[PDB]
Paper text:
ComEA, a DNA-binding protein widely conserved in transformable bacteria, is required for this uptake step. Following this contact with the tpilus, the movement of tDNA into the periplasm is driven by its interaction with the widely conserved periplasmic protein ComEA. A ComEABs contains an N-terminal transmembrane region, a previously unidentified OD, and a C-terminal DNA-binding domain. We show that this domain drives ComEA oligomerization, and that oligomerization is required for genetic transformation.
To gain mechanistic insight into the function of ComEA, we cloned, overexpressed, purified, and determined the X-ray crystal structures of ComEABs and ComEAGs to 3.20 Å and 3.05 Å resolution, respectively. No electron density was evident for the ComEABs DNA-binding domain or linker region, but there was clear density corresponding to a previously undescribed domain (amino acids 60–122). There are seven of these domains arranged head-to-tail in the ComEABs crystallographic asymmetric unit, and we named this region the oligomerization domain (OD). More specifically, in the ComEABs structure, the seven-membered asymmetric unit uses the OD multimerization interface to form a 14-membered head-to-tail ring around the crystallographic two-fold axis. We measured this in vivo by comparing B. subtilis transformation in strains containing wild-type ComEABs; ComEABs-D111N, which disrupts a conserved intermolecular salt-bridge between D111 and R83 (corresponding to ComEAGs Asp113 and Arg85); ComEABs-A106Y (corresponding to ComEAGs-A108Y), which sterically blocks OD multimerization; and ComEA-ΔOD, containing a deletion of the entire OD, while leaving intact both the transmembrane region and the DNA-binding domain. In comparison to wild-type ComEABs, ComEABs-D111N reduced B. subtilis transformation nearly 100-fold. Even more striking were the ComEABs-A106Y and ComEA-ΔOD mutations that reduced B. subtilis transformation about 1,000-fold, a phenotype equivalent to that of a complete comEA deletion. As shown in, the A106Y mutation prevents stable DNA association with competence-expressing cells, which we have shown previously required uptake to the periplasm. To begin to understand the importance of ComEA sidechain interactions to DNA binding and ComEA function, we mutated some of the corresponding interfacial residues in ComEABs (e.g., ComEABs K164 and K193) to alanine and tested their effect on transformation in B. subtilis. Western blot analysis showed that wild-type ComEABs and the ComEABs proteins containing mutations in the HhH motifs were expressed to similar levels. These in vivo studies also showed that the K164A and K199A mutations caused more than a 2-log decrease in transformation, in contrast to the reproducible 2-4-fold effects of K193A and K197A.
Numbering used by the authors:
A (entry chain A), B (entry chain B): 59 to 122
Write the structure that this text describes.
């Protein structure tokens, strides 16, 4: 199969575990998770990294 | 398939994640992102580097 699961913790509206398509990107996970939280610092996160399976996508908070 | 996705952080008008054609250039990403910000320093960035997939394109600010 060509589906994937991802753990989306950090500064997002609905952190949790989501199922993505095999070739998706971090920017898609954040959208899948409702969207970014108003305390997030996306500058140090690569939003076009290919999502690997059974991995974490942490969205840092400003000042971390 | 022959498309690509790119992270455009830095001094641009619309930073974010954009989809480029496989053989595009940094000068094209900047234009796709609305254009340079009025605080950008184009001297320290190579504007015809081949865009690689799932990578960041940081546009420094003057004085960085």
């Amino acid at each position: 199969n060509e589906t994937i699961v991802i753990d989306i913790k950090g500064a997002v509206q609905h952190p949790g575990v989501y199922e993505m398509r095999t070739g998706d990107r971090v920017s898609q996970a954040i959208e899948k998770a409702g969207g970014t939280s108003e305390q997030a610092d996306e500058a140090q996160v690569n939003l076009a990294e290919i999502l690997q399976d059974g991995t974490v996508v942490y969205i840092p908070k400003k000042g971390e």
